Amino acid sequence: TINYHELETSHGRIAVRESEGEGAPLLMIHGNSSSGAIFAPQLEGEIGKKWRVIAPDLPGHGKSTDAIDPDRSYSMEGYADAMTEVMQQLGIADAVVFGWGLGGHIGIEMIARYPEMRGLMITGTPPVAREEVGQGFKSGPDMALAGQEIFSERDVESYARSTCGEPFEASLLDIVARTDGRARRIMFEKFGSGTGGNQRDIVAEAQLPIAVVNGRDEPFVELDFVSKVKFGNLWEGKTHVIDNAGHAPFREAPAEFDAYLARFIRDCTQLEHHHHH
Ligand SMILES: CCCCCC(=O)N[C@H]1CCOC1=O
């Protein structure tokens, strides 16, 4: 019952999946070398049955084309531009946004570009200034692949297994193998070059509700660091941790993840929130 269609955008042709839900819209943004197909549990499950879930593929990812201009598109801020253009074409100005990994960093960059965003949930994403990368992320061989252009077959498998967690499915290899490797290299370099907004300052100053939900056994993100990040309006007043999940709780522990996501959507769309400045 998923509505699949493609949009011609200034970045290239962007693939979009939409759930059947009549309720408030939720944009879900996938991570590095993934695709919106990863959000099957939300798209096809109870979240997507109630709310209008939109899960696009970033340029260079999934069923989208490679970027027309990699130098423009393949960066946290460039992806944020692309997603903002997608939402404009879909006529949706006030989505709640969920971002996974790279997708969470993209969501942070979207705050300035998508002013009627009703909330942002980030999973697998430490808001960090460029000089804080070592504090926010755990060092390791799979983390090292995040910025590597060319993946071998073994790289594809290792990266898919670590980023997606249990259960591994063969379809994941196809998603990761497709990714335009230039996107990994350029996005990583540009983060290091400080090309976009300072994410630490952005989340500290943002007035919209920001929710933080992670798997307890995160292999990429330093949860203690994340629990100390200053947020302007931290949803439910703390960062949340789900047992028996790692980098991808939305698929590893869907029931528990969906409880948080559903409640966040309810809060962001049913309660008053004020911008005092
Ligand atoms: C340069 C900092 C890391 C960039 C963000 C990133 O690539 N995060 C990956 C890690 C696992 O899944 C992702 O999307």
Residue numbers in the entry: 2 to 278
What do the study's own words say?
AidH contains a substrate-binding tunnel between the core domain and the cap domain. Taken together, the present results reveal the catalytic mechanism of the metal-independent AHL-lactonase, which is a typical acid–base covalent catalysis.
Conforming to our predictions, the catalytic triad mutations S102G and H248G disabled AidH from degrading AHLs. Furthermore, in the structure of the complex of AidH and its substrate C6-HSL, each AidH molecule binds one substrate molecule in the active site. The carbonyl O atom in the C6-HSL lactone ring forms hydrogen bonds to the backbones of Asn33 and Leu103, and the Oδ1 atom interacts with the hydroxyl O atom of Tyr160 via a hydrogen bond. To evaluate the role of the nucleophile Ser102 of the catalytic triad in substrate binding, we modelled a hydroxyl group on the side chain of the mutated Gly102 according to the conformation of Ser102 in wild-type AidH. The distance between the hydroxyl O atom of Ser102 and the carbonyl C atom of the C6-HSL lactone ring (2.52 Å) suggests that this C atom is likely to be the target when the nucleophile Ser102 attacks the substrate. One water molecule, W1, close to the lactone ring of the substrate is present in the structure of the AidH–substrate complex. The entrance to the substrate-binding tunnel is in the open state upon substrate or product binding.
